[PDB]
Nucleic acid binder design. Structure first.
Length: 79
DNA sequence: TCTTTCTATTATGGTCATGCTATGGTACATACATTCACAAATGTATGTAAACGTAACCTCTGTAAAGTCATTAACCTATGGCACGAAAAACCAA
């Protein structure tokens, strides 16, 4: 029920990170994986909304996806 | 029960070959260990001497086979002597 009601937050934050690094369906899938990893470690006693906490995780997912291959060769993340 | 009016892939050649190469960006903070790069020591390594033996190797005397030259006598041009066969003189028959 969480993922079927928050796929659209993922696509809304994922359609602004499509700067021609790779085809964007992999970015949609990695955003869904980041949504899963943000739901798996979500707290209730904080009192804040879930989007601000999930934004950092989904940007980390999109960052590691765009820095995973990024070329035909392998370049590390720090480089 | 049956033929037209629409919704999508194949198709047509290459030989003679051309120049100058990239195009926009979008976070950091601990982390623990694999890997490159030098100290220092081992170990087998290479290159310098020294001893024995025969690869031998020329030197010299003795045994052996091959060109030649002492004999001695076999044949062979000579000499003397005696048959021999031709050539001319003689005499007889018709």
């Amino acid at each position: 029920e969480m993922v079927e009601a928050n796929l659209r937050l993922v696509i809304s934050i994922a359609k602004k990170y499509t700067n021609r690094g790779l085809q964007f369906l992999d970015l949609i899938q990695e955003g869904n994986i980041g949504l899963m990893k943000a739901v798996d470690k979500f707290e209730y006693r904080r009192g804040y909304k879930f989007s601000t906490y999930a934004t950092w995780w989904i940007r980390q997912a999109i960052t590691r996806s765009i820095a995973d291959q990024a070329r035909t060769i392998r370049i590390p993340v720090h480089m």
